[PDB]
Amino acid sequence: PTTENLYFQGSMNIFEMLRIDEGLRLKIYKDCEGYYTIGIGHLLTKSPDLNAAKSELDKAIGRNCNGVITKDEAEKLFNQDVDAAVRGILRNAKLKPVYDSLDAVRRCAAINHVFQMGVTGVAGFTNVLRMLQQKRWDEAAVNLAKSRWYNQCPDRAKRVITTFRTGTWDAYKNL
């Protein structure tokens, strides 16, 4: 690793990680599962109704957006959504002990997983949670790769799975 390479971990954090996995879009679009999304992975609604998505958007931002937001608004919403995922882990009796056992990089992977799937989805993966607590990284990554979350939308999840396997930021290098 060069001096620059050793600096790369200091540039990565949960925000930059999710920003790479989710992208940044200023107009409502459908994600890989067909759900209306905006910003940095902000899922607006699971309803097939674009009007519902627009109503949820206006509520989230606090103005009449007509389906479009600014980069600053996307960043603000993203920070709220990341804070929500962390809070959701820490108040959950199943997820908190696993999260606490993880190193800093895998804790980002955990927050990312919860941001993408929600708390009950993540807390339902009984075997993966035990594998992570037991530091069985290869087994945890193989089992994550069986999930519908990964298999239905591999490009958004693959980086996170690698990060659970290695505890490094290597999957986020050289985009």
Side-chain angles (χ1 to χ4, degrees), residues 79-119:
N79 180 70
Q80 295 168 349
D81 284 344
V82 169
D83 289 340
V86 174
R87 172 165 59 256
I89 290 168
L90 291 175
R91 69 190 175 201
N92 185 277
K94 177 84 194 178
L95 299 183
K96 182 178 188 295
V98 181
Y99 178 86
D100 283 352
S101 81
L102 292 174
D103 54 278
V105 175
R106 291 188 181 92
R107 283 180 181 192
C108 293
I111 296 163
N112 185 325
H113 192 198
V114 170
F115 180 113
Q116 298 199 32
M117 281 195 70
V119 168

Side-chain angles (χ1 to χ4, degrees), residues 65 96 102 113 116-117 125 127 136 143 145 152:
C65 298
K96 182 178 188 295
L102 292 174
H113 192 198
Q116 298 199 32
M117 281 195 70
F125 283 2
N127 58 340
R136 290 158 60 194
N143 280 277
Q152 289 191 338

Side-chain angles (χ1 to χ4, degrees), residues 45-58:
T45 180
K46 291 189 178 174
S47 165
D49 195 355
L50 180 58
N51 291 326
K54 286 174 173 178
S55 178
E56 291 301 323
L57 180 59
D58 288 356

Side-chain angles (χ1 to χ4, degrees), residues 5 9 26 32 46 49 61 65 74 82 94 104 139 175:
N5 293 159
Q9 75 176 273
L26 301 189
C32 49
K46 291 189 178 174
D49 195 355
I61 305 298
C65 298
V82 169
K94 177 84 194 178
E139 288 177 83
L175 308 169

Side-chain angles (χ1 to χ4, degrees), residues 31-58 60-70 72-75 77-147 149-168:
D31 75 4
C32 49
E33 291 175 90
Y35 300 132
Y36 294 119
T37 303
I38 200 163
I40 303 164
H42 183 82
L43 174 63
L44 286 162
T45 180
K46 291 189 178 174
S47 165
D49 195 355
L50 180 58
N51 291 326
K54 286 174 173 178
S55 178
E56 291 301 323
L57 180 59
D58 288 356
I61 305 298
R63 63 180 185 81
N64 191 332
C65 298
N66 194 30
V68 176
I69 62 177
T70 68
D72 288 350
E73 284 170 344
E75 292 292 349
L77 183 59
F78 179 46
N79 180 70
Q80 295 168 349
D81 284 344
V82 169
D83 289 340
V86 174
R87 172 165 59 256
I89 290 168
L90 291 175
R91 69 190 175 201
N92 185 277
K94 177 84 194 178
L95 299 183
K96 182 178 188 295
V98 181
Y99 178 86
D100 283 352
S101 81
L102 292 174
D103 54 278
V105 175
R106 291 188 181 92
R107 283 180 181 192
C108 293
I111 296 163
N112 185 325
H113 192 198
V114 170
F115 180 113
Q116 298 199 32
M117 281 195 70
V119 168
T120 64
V122 175
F125 283 2
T126 312
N127 58 340
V128 166
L129 293 172
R130 175 170 64 257
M131 292 165 184
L132 288 173
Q133 195 152 6
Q134 295 181 355
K135 309 102 183 166
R136 290 158 60 194
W137 313 129
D138 291 342
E139 288 177 83
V142 165
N143 280 277
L144 283 170
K146 298 177 187 175
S147 70
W149 163 63
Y150 163 69
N151 284 290
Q152 289 191 338
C153 188
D155 285 340
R156 189 177 59 191
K158 60 189 180 183
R159 263 175 300 272
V160 178
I161 295 179
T162 301
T163 304
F164 277 126
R165 189 177 46 82
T166 66
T168 70

